[PDB]
Amino acid sequence: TSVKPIFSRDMNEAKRRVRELYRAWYREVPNTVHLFQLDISVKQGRDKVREMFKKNAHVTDPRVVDLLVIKGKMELEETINVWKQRTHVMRFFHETEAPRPKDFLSKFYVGHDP
Amino acid sequence: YPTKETAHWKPPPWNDVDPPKSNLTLNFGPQGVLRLVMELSG
Amino acid sequence: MNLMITLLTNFTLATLLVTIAFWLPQLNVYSEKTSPDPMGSARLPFSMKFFLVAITFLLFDLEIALLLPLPWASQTTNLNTMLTMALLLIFLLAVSLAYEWTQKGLEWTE
Amino acid sequence: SRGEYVVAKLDDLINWARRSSLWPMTFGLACCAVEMMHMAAPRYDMDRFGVVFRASPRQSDVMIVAGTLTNKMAPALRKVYDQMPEPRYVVSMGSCANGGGYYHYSYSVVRGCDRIVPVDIYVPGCPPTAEALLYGILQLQKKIKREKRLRIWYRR
Amino acid sequence: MSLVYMNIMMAFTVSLTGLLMYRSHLMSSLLCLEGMMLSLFILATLMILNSHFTLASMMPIILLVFAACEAALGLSLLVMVSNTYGTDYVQNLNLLQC
Amino acid sequence: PLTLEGIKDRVLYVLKLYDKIDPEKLSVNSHFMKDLGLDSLDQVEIIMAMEDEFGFEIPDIDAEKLMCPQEIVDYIADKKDV
Ligand code: SF4
Numbered sequence: 314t315s316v317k318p319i320f321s322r323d324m325n326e327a328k329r330r331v332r333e334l335y336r337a338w339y340r341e342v343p344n345t346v347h348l349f350q351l352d353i354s355v356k357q358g359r360d361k362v363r364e365m366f367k368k369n370a371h372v373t374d375p376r377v378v379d380l381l382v383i384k385g386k387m388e389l390e391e392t393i394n395v396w397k398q399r400t401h402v403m404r405f406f407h408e409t410e411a412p413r414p415k416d417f418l419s420k421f422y423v424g425h426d427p
Numbered sequence: 428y429p430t431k432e433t434a435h436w437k438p439p440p441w442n443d444v445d446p447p448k449s450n451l452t453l454n455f456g457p458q459g460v461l462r463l464v465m466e467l468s469g
Numbered sequence: 470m471n472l473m474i475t476l477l478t479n480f481t482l483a484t485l486l487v488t489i490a491f492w493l494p495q496l497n498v499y500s501e502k503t504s505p506d507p508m509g510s511a512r513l514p515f516s517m518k519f520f521l522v523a524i525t526f527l528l529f530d531l532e533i534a535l536l537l538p539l540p541w542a543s544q545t546t547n548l549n550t551m552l553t554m555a556l557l558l559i560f561l562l563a564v565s566l567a568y569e570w571t572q573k574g575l576e577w578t579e
Numbered sequence: 580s581r582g583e584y585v586v587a588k589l590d591d592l593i594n595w596a597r598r599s600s601l602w603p604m605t606f607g608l609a610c611c612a613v614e615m616m617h618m619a620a621p622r623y624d625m626d627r628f629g630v631v632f633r634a635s636p637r638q639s640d641v642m643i644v645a646g647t648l649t650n651k652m653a654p655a656l657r658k659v660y661d662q663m664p665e666p667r668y669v670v671s672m673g674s675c676a677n678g679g680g681y682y683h684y685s686y687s688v689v690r691g692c693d694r695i696v697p698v699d700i701y702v703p704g705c706p707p708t709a710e711a712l713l714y715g716i717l718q719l720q721k722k723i724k725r726e727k728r729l730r731i732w733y734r735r
Numbered sequence: 736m737s738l739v740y741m742n743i744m745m746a747f748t749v750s751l752t753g754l755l756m757y758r759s760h761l762m763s764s765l766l767c768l769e770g771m772m773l774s775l776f777i778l779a780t781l782m783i784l785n786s787h788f789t790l791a792s793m794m795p796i797i798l799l800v801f802a803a804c805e806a807a808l809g810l811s812l813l814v815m816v817s818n819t820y821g822t823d824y825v826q827n828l829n830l831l832q833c
Numbered sequence: 834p835l836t837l838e839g840i841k842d843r844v845l846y847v848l849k850l851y852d853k854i855d856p857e858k859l860s861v862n863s864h865f866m867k868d869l870g871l872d873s874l875d876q877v878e879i880i881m882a883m884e885d886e887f888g889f890e891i892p893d894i895d896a897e898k899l900m901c902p903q904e905i906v907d908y909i910a911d912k913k914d915v
Contacts, residue, residue, distance in 0.1 A: 329893055335874060336881060350505060363874060394464070395454050395509040398654045436833035445830065448820075451514050453507035457655045458636060459607060465507065469516050469577070499665035515817055524807050531800050 319379045327375045330382045331366075337389055338362050345392050349399050353406070361405055518578040525569060532562065582733060590729040597640070597666070598723040600629045601716070604639035604663065606656070608646025611673040611706045615645050618709035630716065639663055641719065643712075644692045645672035647682060653695050660696045668723075670700040670715060677701050739781065747774040760823040761813050765806065772802060834887075834913060841906050847886050848902065851879065865900045876900070883909070 321327040342358045345351070351358075372378055391397055414420045420427070440446075453465035536558055545551055569575065605615055619625055619632050626632060636642075636659055648656060660667065671692060674680025682688040692698060699722065702715040750770035757763050780795045816823040834840050849856050853875060863869055865876045880896050887909065899905055 329897075332873075332877060333893060335877060339878060339881060348510065366874065367872075394452075396464075399505065400654045439833065449511075452509065452511060454509055455507055457652065458659055460652070469514070469518070497665070502661070504661060512821075515814070517814070517818075520810075520814055524810060527807050528804065531803055534796065535800060 316376065319376055320383075321375050321379045324373070324375050327378045327382065331378065334382055334385050334389065335362075335366060338385075341389065341392060345402065348395070349402055351399070351402065365405075521574065522578060525574070528565075529562070532558070532565075536562075583730065586729040586733045590727060593729075594724055594726055598720045601641050601668075601720070602631050602634040602639050604636045604642045604659070605633060606642065606644050606646065606659075608644075608648070608652075609673075609675060611645035611675070611704075614706035614709060615643065615672065615712065618712050620709070623709045623713060625713070625716070628713075628716065628720075636663055640666070641668040641670060642696075643670045643672055644676040644696075644698075647675040647679075648689045648692045648695065650687045650689060653689055656692070657695050668700075668719060669696050669698045670702060670712075670719060671698050672702050672704075672707060672712065674703065674705045677703060680705060737785075740778070743774055743778045743781070747771065747778075750774060757825070760825060761809075761816065762823065764825075765809050765813070768806065768809070772799070772806070834915070837906065837910065837915065840909070840915075841902070843886070844883070844902060844906060847882055848879070851875075851882065862901060862903055 321330060339359060339362065342362060343355045346353060346355055346358055369381060372381075392402070414423055451467040451469075453463070453467060455461075455463040455465055536555075539551075539555060542551055605612065617623075642660065642663065644656070660669070669692075671677050675682065675688075676692040676698075679685070679688050679690040683690055689695065700715050700719045702712055704711055707715075750767050753770065754764060754767035757767075776795055776799060779798055783791045783794055813823050816827075820827045845861075848854065849859065854869065854871070858869070860868075865871050865879065866873075876899075877896075880891055880899065883905065884891050895908065899908055
């Protein structure tokens with residue numbers, strides 16, 4: 314059960330890195346909104362950042378959240394420079410996607426998908 | 428003879444040298460095909 | 470007045486050409502371009518060599534204007550003074566070029 | 580009447596003018612771009628048709644999508660197409676820009692460049708031969724030749 | 736004298752009232768300096784060409800060249816400000832008062 | 834940042850500038866975790882609002898325990914002169 318750590322020895326260091334990554338993302342969000350002449354507000358983008366951060370919050374393995382911290386830092390670094398277009402930033406907002414049925418009755422009406 | 432208007436005039440530096448208070452970065456478009464992130468100093 | 474007539478005719482023909490190129494295709498109903506360069510957000514760098522070579526061009530053109538009236542001056546009576554003055558002025562141009570060579574002027578934009 | 584005949588004459592005049600000087604924008608993506616360059620060889624010689632070689636994308640009239648259009652390149656191609664002035668035409672080289680071809684079921688290949696830009700002439704091949712693209716260009720010229728812009732404008 | 740002479744005086748006074756009460760950076764001051772340049776050149780050339788003083792045709796050209804080099808000096812000064820404060824504004828020239 | 838009353842007043846002002854907090858339930862000794870019922874990231878942006886409006890670097894090893902406004906003003910007061 315003994316494994317080799319990546320960057321964080323325990324859960325607390327991974328939590329601290331999560332905090333630092335969220336701080337950097339919260340710093341960047343207004344500049345990202347202004348740079349790409351986005352149609353969203355600042356608070357909508359920060360709400361999206363929070364929604365991703367809380368969607369990816371049910372895992373307690375330090376190595377898993379360490380890898381997720383590294384991937385989020387790559388995302389942050391890619392948004393630091395002008396490497397993405399407007400499309401790659403706007404991909405997080407599923408706007409053109411039609412809302413799928415969620416309750417059982419509409420899912421029964423539309424097809425066989427559970 | 429300090430007054431209200433001239434109350435914020437600091438003494439000059441003793442060496443009379445003002446404190447000093449980067450490089451170009453290019454994003455070449457893909458318009459083979461290559462996208463170059465180019466750093467220039469002139 | 471004939472020279473100004475030619476200038477006015479030429480300028481009005483250029484105006485007609487730019488009016489054809491600017492307002493004649495506006496009859497078409499093609500599209501409206503919303504349209505949402507390597508320069509991302511950085512300020513324009515001040516490449517000092519370009520300004521230096523521009524003011525060097527300015528000084529050389531000024532003393533070229535000094536050097537100009539030799540074809541009219543060649544009929545003067547005192548030819549020796551003219552020859553000394555012209556040779557010394559071109560020597561001054563050579564000396565200024567040599568100084569602009571020596572003090573790192575012709576480097577990194579040769 | 581006088582008006583329909585006059586606008587028909589003006590329509591075929593401007594139609595010949597547009598179809599006789601098609602300046603292209605070559606997208607040098609993949610194999611089909613090398614086949615385009617070999618169509619630019621002295622044997623086939625596009626330049627006798629009024630088609631210049633390697634024009635700037637801000638003045639070109641037609642665009643030839645030669646190669647595979649992946650996911651990482653589609654916004655750039657859409658930006659280039661949006662920058663090119665009207666009227667603009669698109670000619671599809673190869674199976675890659677037609678329907679993906681070999682890489683139709685790949686994860687990062689757009690299944691046809693029709694999903695990004697409107698496409699007028701589809702040229703089939705892998706790669707299509709140089710004379711096949713020459714015939715496609717002549718077909719595009721004939722498609723321009725039967726355009727009826729001024730007649731429709733006068734009728735509307 | 737002639738009316739064109741008085742027009743040149745009024746032009747020079749216009750350049751004077753533009754050179755002193757500026758609001759922009761040093762480029763406006765150098766442009767008004769070039770206005771003074773041009774007005775003095777045209778006035779000297781008109782005077783020399785009207786009174787048939789043949790030798791004093793040395794006056795106009797020289798009246799440019801010297802100060803033209805001086806004008807070049809001013810450009811270098813602006814570049815120094817452009818190498819120190821980023822912008823060449825005159826409101827940044829408040830460091831020598833204290 | 835002159836007297837403790839003014840700095841805690843501006844801390845309270847920027848604290849009820851936050852819109853997910855309830856000023857009716859808000860007190861001067863309340864807790865960001867249990868009494869206010871706020872998520873940890875909300876406390877993070879409260880710390881960053883302090884950072885932005887005051888203008889220095891609040892580190893990560895000492896912002897973990899800054900769960901009350903009294904400790905907020907204590908931490909910025911001992912790190913400053915006051
Ligand atoms: S269609 Fe065939 S020849 Fe053309 S780019 Fe694709 S793989 Fe290459």
